[PDB]
Amino acid sequence: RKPKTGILMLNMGGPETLGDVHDFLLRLFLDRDLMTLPIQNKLAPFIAKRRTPKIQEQYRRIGGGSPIKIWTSKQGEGMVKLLDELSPNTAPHKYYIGFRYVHPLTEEAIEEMERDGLERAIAFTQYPQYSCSTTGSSLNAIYRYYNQVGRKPTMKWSTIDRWPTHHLLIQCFADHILKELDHFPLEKRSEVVILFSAHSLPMSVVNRGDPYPQEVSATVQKVMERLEYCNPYRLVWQSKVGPMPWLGPQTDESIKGLCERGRKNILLVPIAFTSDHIETLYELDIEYSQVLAKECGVENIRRAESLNGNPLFSKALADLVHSHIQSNELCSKQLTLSCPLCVNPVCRETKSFFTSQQL
Amino acid sequence: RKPKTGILMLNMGGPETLGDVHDFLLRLFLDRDLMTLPIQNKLAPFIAKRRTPKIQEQYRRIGGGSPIKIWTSKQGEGMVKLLDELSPNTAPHKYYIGFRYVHPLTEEAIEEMERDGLERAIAFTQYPQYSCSTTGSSLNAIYRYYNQVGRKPTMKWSTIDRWPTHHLLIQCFADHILKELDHFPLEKRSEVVILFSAHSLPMSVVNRGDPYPQEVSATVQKVMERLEYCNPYRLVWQSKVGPMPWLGPQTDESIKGLCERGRKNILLVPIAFTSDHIETLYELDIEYSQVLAKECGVENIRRAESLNGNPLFSKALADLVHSHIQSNELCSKQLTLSCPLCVNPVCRETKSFFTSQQL
Numbered sequence: 001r002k003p004k005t006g007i008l009m010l011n012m013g014g015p016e017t018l019g020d021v022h023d024f025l026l027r028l029f030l031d032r033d034l035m036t037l038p039i040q041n042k043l044a045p046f047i048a049k050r051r052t053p054k055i056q057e058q059y060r061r062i063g064g065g066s067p068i069k070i071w072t073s074k075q076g077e078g079m080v081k082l083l084d085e086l087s088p089n090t091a092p093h094k095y096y097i098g099f100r101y102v103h104p105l106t107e108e109a110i111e112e113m114e115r116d117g118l119e120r121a122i123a124f125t126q127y128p129q130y131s132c133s134t135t136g137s138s139l140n141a142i143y144r145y146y147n148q149v150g151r152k153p154t155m156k157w158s159t160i161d162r163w164p165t166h167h168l169l170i171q172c173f174a175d176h177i178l179k180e181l182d183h184f185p186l187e188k189r190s191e192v193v194i195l196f197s198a199h200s201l202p203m204s205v206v207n208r209g210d211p212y213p214q215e216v217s218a219t220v221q222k223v224m225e226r227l228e229y230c231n232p233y234r235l236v237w238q239s240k241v242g243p244m245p246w247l248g249p250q251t252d253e254s255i256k257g258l259c260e261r262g263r264k265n266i267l268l269v270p271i272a273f274t275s276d277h278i279e280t281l282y283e284l285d286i287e288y289s290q291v292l293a294k295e296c297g298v299e300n301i302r303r304a305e306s307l308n309g310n311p312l313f314s315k316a317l318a319d320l321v322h323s324h325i326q327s328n329e330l331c332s333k334q335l336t337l338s339c340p341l342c343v344n345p346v347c348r349e350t351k352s353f354f355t356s357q358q359l
Numbered sequence: 360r361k362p363k364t365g366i367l368m369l370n371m372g373g374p375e376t377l378g379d380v381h382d383f384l385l386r387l388f389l390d391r392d393l394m395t396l397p398i399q400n401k402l403a404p405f406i407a408k409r410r411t412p413k414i415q416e417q418y419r420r421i422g423g424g425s426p427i428k429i430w431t432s433k434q435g436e437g438m439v440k441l442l443d444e445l446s447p448n449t450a451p452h453k454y455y456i457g458f459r460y461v462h463p464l465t466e467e468a469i470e471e472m473e474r475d476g477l478e479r480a481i482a483f484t485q486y487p488q489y490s491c492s493t494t495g496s497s498l499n500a501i502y503r504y505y506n507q508v509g510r511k512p513t514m515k516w517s518t519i520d521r522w523p524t525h526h527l528l529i530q531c532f533a534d535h536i537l538k539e540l541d542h543f544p545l546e547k548r549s550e551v552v553i554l555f556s557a558h559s560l561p562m563s564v565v566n567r568g569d570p571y572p573q574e575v576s577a578t579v580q581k582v583m584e585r586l587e588y589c590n591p592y593r594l595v596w597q598s599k600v601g602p603m604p605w606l607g608p609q610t611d612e613s614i615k616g617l618c619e620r621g622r623k624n625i626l627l628v629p630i631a632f633t634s635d636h637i638e639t640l641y642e643l644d645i646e647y648s649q650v651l652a653k654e655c656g657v658e659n660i661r662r663a664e665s666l667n668g669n670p671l672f673s674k675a676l677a678d679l680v681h682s683h684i685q686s687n688e689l690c691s692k693q694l695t696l697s698c699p700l701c702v703n704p705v706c707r708e709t710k711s712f713f714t715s716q717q718l
């Protein structure tokens with residue numbers, strides 16, 4: 001039996017091996033939805049080859065590459081098997097992986113989606129919190145596809161563009177946090193500082209009105225509420241890159257700063273990206289961690305697990321697709337509003353694309 | 360009969376008349392908990408004198424002054440009256456007004472709380488979201504007082520240092536928003552953009568690790584969930600003041616930007632300060648409102664009411680004190696953690712002051 005309802009899972013993806021790094025950065029620095037540079041078509045191929053060594057080193061430090069493709073597939077299969085039982089009417093359900101910077105590319109997934117002749121297609125972002133640089137770009141890619149190809153869609157599109165506070169997403173964070181808290185000495189458990197750490201954004205993106213900072217902040221509050229504020233916490237921002245101003249406090253500074261002030265037990269929480277990724281300076285570079293413990297007497301710096309393959313996550317995914325199908329909405333109301341200082345002509349077009357879909 | 364349980368309502372206060380503007384600014388720029396300047400004791404008087412004209416002008420544009428004292432008394436009386444019934448064991452209760460920069464000063468209130476012979480004092484901040492420059496300074500003032508009169512408290516202190524998501528606070532916001540939405544033509548309601556507007560913080564305070572932006576974001580999300588995301592929204596920051604970088608987007612530029620992009624109906628919501636204050640450029644300056652109205656034809660720009668006299672607010676204030684008293688907590692868990700990059704040695708002393716209190 002042919003597939004009825006297709007679920008396109010959107011993410012930036014990641015280099016499978018250190019060999020895939022160059023082409024990851026290449027596509028990344030070419031993404032005008034993410035950034036605009038002078039003579040970009042020529043500077044991109046450069047910067048990519050230029051930073052490849054550095055990025056290659058960082059991925060080596062965490063296993064040799066990104067496991068996103070595998071976790072997404074395993075999560076997708078778990079979502080589908082549950083979707084076939086939850087909503088018989090829209091079954092069979094089939095999932096497609098739509099990575100932005102590496103194969104299987106977004107356009108490739110759409111292209112294949114068109115061929116299987118689906119009745120309904122769902123652009124399901126894998127970023128719980130919305131940013132024009134993440135979800136925005138993935139959704140813009142879909143619009144850019146049909147327009148670069150020159151023809152209209154042959155299936156009904158809709159989208160789950162954000163889910164910063166989905167009750168089952170919150171339950172998974174709380175569970176992973178409790179699980180890691182148990183790894184600290186029993187007599188220090190209540191002194192542990194929970195440090196929520198999300199990827200920073202350049203202030204120029206924040207200042208034009210990106211909704212990301214506000215949604216990440218909302219996820220954090222729901223998690224602490226579920227945990228009944230058992231420990232103190234802070235929302236900090238990691239991996240800023242370059243010399244320009246980025247939203248702080250930086251995770252690096254915060255850990256050092258916190259240690260210089262007596263807090264020896266820290267629990268980092270990946271609150272805005274659901275799969276493993278590049279870690280922070282004090283977790284990786286061993287030379288810096290020594291100086292740290294030698295002066296501040298750092299006791300424990302731990303990191304909660306990523307929602308990788310927790311089966312309770314698949315239940316979160318399927319529950320979202322199910323609700324979406326039952327509500328008949330084409331996108332959240334937040335998507336109908338562009339950033340106050342948006343200067344990307346494609347944003348409006350992508351918006352209209354989804355609000356204008358049939359059914 | 361004498362007062363048993365005293366409730367100290369903390370806030371920055373405000374100039375009652377245009378004549379009280381100088382001393383207000385004076386005490387403000389002298390606040391070391393708010394900002395640190397070189398030879399501050401000399402520079403403060405100058406800055407205060409140099410800005411009084413502009414601030415007097417601003418307050419005149421809104422009626423000639425701030426009504427914070429009157430509204431706080433009203434809410435205070437309503438809170439006390441409701442407590443005496445909710446908590447008979449701690450009754451009778453008495454509210455005191457502790458403004459930071461104008462009479463009745465924080466110190467004046469504490470000094471009077473002693474004389475009344477209270478056997479319990481509650482430092483209750485009127486800012487739902489915590490910032491070191493707001494609630495932090497007012498709490499630091501309580502510690503700075505006893506550390507001046509060289510003596511110790513004759514009563515037991517405790518504090519309600521934050522309440523960003525108190526359910527009755529959320530209901531009030533949603534009620535005022537719905538009520539204001541009705542003032543727009545009904546054929547345009549669903550298109551009204553809800554602009555939550557909170558006072559900005561300098562980027563140096565944000566990067567230091569101030570919890571304010573994350574708590575304000577939490578209030579926003581709670582309010583929108585309560586309204587069913589009936590309209591699109593954005594959290595923006597107002598009253599920048601100065602040349603240095605502050606957290607954006609700025610309310611002024613967001614309104615201009617939103618209008619330049621076809622969003623004609625905007626609803627402004629004062630989400631982080633519960634009483635009337637200085638408004639934005641497009642609400643005051645008539646020269647700008649016109650340019651805006653004709654360069655990009657804006658239809659309606661309205662501001663929801665401040666949670667001034669709404670009785671449901673008094674009920675929120677009372678429900679908080681009651682819950683606080685029955686939980687037996689001395690402060691929130693969050694107060695036990697200082698900012699990652701704190702450089703104010705008084706902060707941790709203020710912390711110990713509250714966590715070390717009897718019972």
Ligand code: FDE
Nearest residue numbers: 035051055131133134199200201202212239241273277278
């Ligand atoms: C401008 C910008 C913005 C943004 C945003 C963001 C968000 C919201 C999220 C995110 C993410 C990310 N990224 Fe992001 N972002 C950016 C960027 C970037 C770059 C450039 C890169 C590559 C690396 C280097 O250094 O080069 C990235 C990248 C990135 C990735 C990979 C990395 C790691 O670390 O792992 C991640 C996952 N990013 N992101």
Ligand code: FDE
Nearest residue numbers: 393394410414490492493558559560561598600632636637
């Ligand atoms: C640095 C800083 C920080 C901060 C924060 C804050 C928050 C969180 C909240 C707030 C508030 C306020 N303020 Fe604030 N702040 C600041 C500041 C300031 C100043 C300088 C002033 C006076 C005015 C002028 O211009 O000078 C103020 C001020 C202020 C007041 C008065 C105004 C109006 O607008 O009305 C208000 C209410 N503040 N705020």
Ligand SMILES: C[C@H](CCC(=O)O)[C@H]1CC[C@H]2[C@@H]3[C@H](O)C[C@@H]4C[C@H](O)CC[C@]4(C)[C@H]3C[C@H](O)[C@]12C
Nearest residue numbers: 036037038039043044046047048050204242244
């Ligand atoms: C000027 C432009 C930013 C323009 C803008 O923000 O509006 C910035 C962004 C990318 C930068 C370039 C990239 O960082 C790659 C190169 C880095 C070298 O250290 C300087 C030359 C170099 C070629 C940079 C020149 C210049 O600083 C660029 C081109």
Ligand SMILES: C[C@H](CCC(=O)O)[C@H]1CC[C@H]2[C@@H]3[C@H](O)C[C@@H]4C[C@H](O)CC[C@]4(C)[C@H]3C[C@H](O)[C@]12C
Nearest residue numbers: 034035036037047050051202204241242243244
């Ligand atoms: C960090 C990287 C340069 C790396 C390198 O030279 O090795 C530089 C080059 C292109 C830069 C970006 C582009 O200049 C476009 C944006 C310009 C804004 O002022 C900051 C964010 C912004 C998104 C920049 C972030 C950062 O400074 C980038 C990404």
Ligand SMILES: C[C@H](CCC(=O)O)[C@H]1CC[C@H]2[C@@H]3[C@H](O)C[C@@H]4C[C@H](O)CC[C@]4(C)[C@H]3C[C@H](O)[C@]12C
Nearest residue numbers: 394395396397398399402403405406409601602
């Ligand atoms: C140098 C000092 C900041 C020191 C520090 O951060 O460690 C800053 C903060 C307050 C500033 C002063 C205030 O802004 C008041 C004046 C403003 C004028 O535009 C310049 C002179 C002026 C007198 C400023 C001189 C200088 O930039 C000051 C004194």
Ligand SMILES: C[C@H](CCC(=O)O)[C@H]1CC[C@H]2[C@@H]3[C@H](O)C[C@@H]4C[C@H](O)CC[C@]4(C)[C@H]3C[C@H](O)[C@]12C
Nearest residue numbers: 393394395396406409410561563600601602603
């Ligand atoms: C706006 C005001 C000067 C007003 C005037 O000259 O008429 C200046 C003088 C003191 C300055 C503050 C002080 O320099 C202390 C802080 C320094 C940080 O770098 C920015 C925020 C910070 C809080 C400054 C905000 C703003 O630039 C202030 C408040």
Ligand code: FES
Nearest residue numbers: 132338339342347
């Ligand atoms: S950059 Fe946010 S809608 Fe275009």
Ligand code: FES
Nearest residue numbers: 491697698701706
């Ligand atoms: S500045 Fe935040 S605790 Fe001191």
Ligand SMILES: [Cl-]
Nearest residue numbers: 336337338620
């Ligand atoms: Cl829009």
